[PDB]
Amino acid sequence: GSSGSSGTKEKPYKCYECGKAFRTRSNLTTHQVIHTGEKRSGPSSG
């Protein structure tokens, strides 16, 4: 039958990288950048 099941309509997006939250995606990704490395790898694994 129909399909209706969710958790909430607020900060539904949760960063699987650290565990943060965000109302939308843009607001989330913009933060996920901290987990995104660049060509020039730093002292950390990445």
Contacts with Zn ion by CB under 5 A lie at: 15, 17-18, 20
Which uninterrupted H or E stretch holds 14? strand 13-14
Place of tokens 């960063």: 15
Q: Which is nearer to Zn ion, 2 or 38 (by Cβ)?
A: 38
Least separation in angstroms between CB 29 and Zn ion: 10
Q: Which is nearer to Zn ion, 18 or 27 (by Cβ)?
A: 18
Q: Which is nearer to Zn ion, 1 or 19 (by Cβ)?
A: 19
Q: What is the C-alpha separation between 14 and 22, in angstroms, rounded?
A: 6
